[model samples]
Target chain A: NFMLNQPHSVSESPGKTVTISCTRSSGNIDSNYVQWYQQRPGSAPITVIYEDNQRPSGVPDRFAGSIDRSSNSASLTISGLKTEDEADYYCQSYDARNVVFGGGTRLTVLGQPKAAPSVTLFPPSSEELQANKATLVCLISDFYPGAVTVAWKADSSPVKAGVETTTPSKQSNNKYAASSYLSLTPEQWKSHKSYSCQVTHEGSTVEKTVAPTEC
Target chain B: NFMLNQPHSVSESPGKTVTISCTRSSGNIDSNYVQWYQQRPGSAPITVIYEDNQRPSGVPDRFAGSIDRSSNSASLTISGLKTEDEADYYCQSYDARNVVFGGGTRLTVLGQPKAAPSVTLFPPSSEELQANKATLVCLISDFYPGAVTVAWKADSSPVKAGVETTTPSKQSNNKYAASSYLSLTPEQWKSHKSYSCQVTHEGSTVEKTVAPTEC
Candidate 1:
């Protein structure tokens, strides 16, 4: 259920024309540098490809890029696909140390259709470990036209994500319910620890993970 | 004569599935939001518009986006337009406060067609501003497969009045080559101030206004 129509979440519109083609099973990714990550929610995961697309100096071309290693695959074309192009796209490569994400693509910029978000994690008392306190709750019902981003990542990478606003949620895409809560420190908590509540609707990337006693 | 078929560069042979389109001038565009800019030589032009079709905010989905604003134009369909989809593609809109460019489209993935790019600007502090910074730089020099965007502003107004790069002519199609610069600043440099570089190529927008300058 993981896909490949990806060079990483692209979009279209404006004078109108579209095409994204890549086919790399293996062969052709030997280093001209290839990296692309967007993450757009509070922030953390931004590297619109490097070395050749050469964006990293700052990054922002309405986020439309491209590459083709004799068909090894690499494409990013986003022309007039607004609504923030609906956040979430990955095609990174700089394997020199660590960074290779292309199993993520969630973009949804319609008008309505966003629901299903429920998360709760609060655990940290191994002995007041640096006051890593406790609290990470989420309740999003009947999703439709909803957009939210909440933090913290160490192994999942992205050490500090944002946008919780404080128990925020607006719902039925609008006429329903929404909730959020986050606060932790118990040494930053770790033990079956892997927290992620990435929910973006339109193109699609729905994630919900909370451990360390479900925290 | 703004003509565009896309493919000054194209190749996704790695994983297959390619589509990259950006057409314009069928006559249409008020706000489909087609702002895609990326300049890799010096820098400053990276907004990567991921709003309308959704891909901003973490941007990554194997790259696939869409748009069809009725042909006035809008596109960035990178299903796999690898080889970094080459480079140079300007189709912005906002031409009200500083951002209006379109007559730049480049895409060169591989296979020969280099030579023809030598645009140098930034040496016009004397000849009385060298006609607004003497710019007619199109030193393409190579297309061993493509990516070129030159011929500024025949019309792609996204609130920009200047600045650009290009990639096209994988093997000749209108041939691509033109140089002119008229950036006015001495109060818009008036001797009557008639600055023109009008270009749209094959689709129409050919102009020449370097004939009216005074120090």
Candidate 2:
């Protein structure tokens, strides 16, 4: 069995240092093989540490991992905390019988920049619809806090088919950008009076509408 | 960014040794903190290795994990492979950006044992159902390979509600056993004349039926 200990949340300011701790209730802490992960909203978890403080290539030097076998605890430290570091952190360990994960510690970078995403809609061209196929792209950009929801709709109803949403990718300017795609057949496009792309950020909604003429 | 290499499958007889290998195709392999997992069919994965070759408590000594840094590969060796050990194995590693898992290797312990599960049905007792409640228990035992599917049915139609199945647990004689529970109200229990518990193992089906005489 494996039992992990972690705080529910923590707050830190930019340019400061933060260290999150995870304690174990059972298992061989002597192995010192704890792994730490960082997960931004609407994105998959990213690895920051593996085994006894070994940092992989491309990870910043300010991020460090350590273990105290005597206390049966593991720690992940972040120096110069930035708005980009605001996310959830998790620790994983193996208990000889199974691998278990912590409840996750939410890191809130206090007094950080926040912005809404700009939306764009690109529907397929008529020529590209020769085979009754259509592709629609919704591009979102300049979002801060890096969490947003993009949804598609047909005639005001939700559209769940032929939809693909990309994870928010960090942009060069320290903001975030993402994209979503919706593909439909000519019948679906012609039957529906209108199609729309909706992006929700920080409790606000940004919508863009398109007509069949665009395709 | 992680690259994992593993064979499709391997087979070995009892008292023999088998080694499954995982080769890194890209990313940093300098850290020796590879984790290994064993997944039995229709069950949660079990951890066998964490942080290189360190085995946690309760793991049998016959299973060992090792790494060859120069070859950019990790391996798990099981000495004296037992019939109970037939299952799929996976390896995981942390890249600087993410954690990746291998394609998995299926190991078959050749020529050991094979048997279909024996199923028994226990309906709620009249004394226990005083509050208009009923509970059904389906017990499955003597299964080999530790993999079996248990299903509940009413009047030959599959039942899916209020069914809770437990993972197979090791028995005293090295066999495996599992249980599934179905809770129902008095009306629901008496409405159907036929209720059955089916156990499927190695392509064979064993069924036990009980009517609501107590209800």
Candidate 3:
């Protein structure tokens, strides 16, 4: 189905490099740097840049990124883009104090999956508690197709899934979102308070925790 | 007076690869991720890794990191590791529901050394907890170059800097230490009960947080 104003899809066949473009509105954004975000169906994004090609601290080398120092644009190239790459792509840049996000690009993987299904979890800050539960939202809006499963990990144990997620779908953006619930009842919030949100899409588990609240 | 143990001095150039090594006693690590920390002079450790090479929820990619799967060793490499990169390195990890920190590794950026510094009052701990009087000790330990500013921020506004200073010497490792004293007139403690420890160091200010404790 063809629709005008629809974001240009930046995908390609297996083993081919796909080039996705993100152009920004003309404004005063000279010193700002471009950032690329990768998030699979029902998962959080992995940032690819900070202030230009300078990767923040622990960014992976595989996700190639390039920025046009003049055109105020950026592109992320996934080499041999595989099944695990079937997720939305995003671009970000500094707007001064805060960061601005892109419309997001989606990558479609070809053929069958060769690895175990994985889930990526996004907690607000680090300090991931062992007994504390992590709440994750699936998608951002409520007008999309697909309901993903979210689980929790407690002390090297399997996830304890729980709750009837109350999520609303937004037709305006054509996306769907649901709250992920994973709790450890009858346990001390300090002793067993840390828990991780694991989203299984295809087959992968992306985990995250908050950096201690100290600045 | 260069010590034999301190091979890393204030004469190194940028891009010179450096290795930070630490050995942990057995019976502790049970988690998958290891956090390599970077302390900018007087600032706290900024996370470089979690469960190996994974970055924070929305961190950029340039801050790349790697961990050896076979040797159980972790390494953080910042290409173009700049001059401001002069600071300390600490290895942090999480397990058994507790936050673990390694004995720190300090990186001194090449520059003319300045006069010995002092420690100032940092926040959340800058109060007159008058058990009897304004007998509150703004415990600003765990920070180096202790001589820093201790001010409160109303929303985001800074309070004031204390005058007293504590320089750890001989038995104290000459580490910076500080505390602010105010008349713990109950009313004063109640008034600024929501203050935070804002350490102003190296043209930058960092805050330490004290989560409310239940006594």
Over the stretch A77-191, how does candidate 2's per-residue lDDT look in tens digits? 9999987787788887765555777778888888867888766565554334664656665656678877898889999999988765555655434567655657687788878
Best by TM-score: 2
lDDT of each: 0.42, 0.73, 0.43
Q: For each model, chain A TM-score?
A: 0.26, 0.61, 0.45
Q: Name the top lDDT candidate.
A: 2
Best by DockQ: 2
Write one digit per residue (lDDT tens) for candidate 3, span B72-160: 54565555556867765555554544434554555544344333332222222221132332222232332343234445443354544
Q: Could you give the candidate ranking by TM-score, starting with the highest? A: 2, 3, 1
RMSD in Å for model 2: 21.6
List where candidate 2 sits over 4 angstroms from the true fold: A1-4, A24-54, A66-72, A88-104, A125-128, A144-215, B1-3, B6-34, B37-215
| Tens-place lDDT digits, model 1, residues A132-168 | 3443433333444545554445448654532232323
- CA lDDT of A208 in candidate 2? 83
lDDT preference between candidates 2 and 3, better one: 2
Judging by TM-score, tell me the better candidate of 1 and 2: 2
Q: Could you tally the backbone clashes for each prediction?
A: 180, 0, 58
Estimate, for each residue in A1-215, the C-alpha lDDT of model 3 and write its tens digit.
11001143655667777766666665533456675656432222455554455454465554676766586666676777654466676665543323355556666655532333222222221122322432322111122243455555564566535422323221212233333433223232234434555554435444533212233
Sorted on lDDT, highest at the top, how do the candidates line up? 2, 3, 1
Q: What would the TM-score be for candidate 3 when compared with the true structure?
A: 0.27
lDDT score, residue A13, model 1? 42
